[PDB]
Design a binder for this molecule. Sequence first.
Ligand code: FMN
Length: 169
Amino acid sequence: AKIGLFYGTQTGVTQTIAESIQQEFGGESIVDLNDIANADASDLNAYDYLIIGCPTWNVGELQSDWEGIYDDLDSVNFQGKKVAYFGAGDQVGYSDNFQDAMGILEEKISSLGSQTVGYWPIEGYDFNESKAVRNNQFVGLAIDEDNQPDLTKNRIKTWVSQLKSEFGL
Ligand SMILES: Cc1cc2nc3c(=O)[nH]c(=O)nc-3n(C[C@H](O)[C@H](O)[C@H](O)COP(=O)(O)O)c2cc1C
């Protein structure tokens, strides 16, 4: 598969989202699904297209497995890659740090030469601050299973449709 999806998860939500994204794209032959806990930073070199999934924990921190590999990201040549992002969060309980992890990863990876694609509009959300917002859009798909579980299915389908174009599908 030419698209590699790497996710990290504490309670399983981001994994569930990752599986739905893969299925939406068309399955295993279209997207490779990988838990970043089992990966090496160099594994990211194999793809032209990447999807990065990461929930925000402990008031604005990266999920643990992403935190562990964070410093090794500098060794990956992101030049020429197109990268999309998704994250799970809680806009009510963490209004001032909603989806911060997604924003932190995007900032690091884009500065290494990749092009971010898959921007998502902020309509329908209610939060005060987020490190994942640029030009009044989220840098990736913001999922909130804690407060908006009913919006998830549709958010994923719509986001994947738009991404397909960018990934030459
Ligand atoms: C103690 C705690 C701290 C959290 N901190 C944040 C946060 O800073 N920002 C945010 O958007 N969501 C935060 N959340 C919400 C989680 O990201 C959310 O529950 C998500 O679904 C967890 O995904 P996971 O199962 O993939 O780890 C927090 C959740 C808990 C229980």
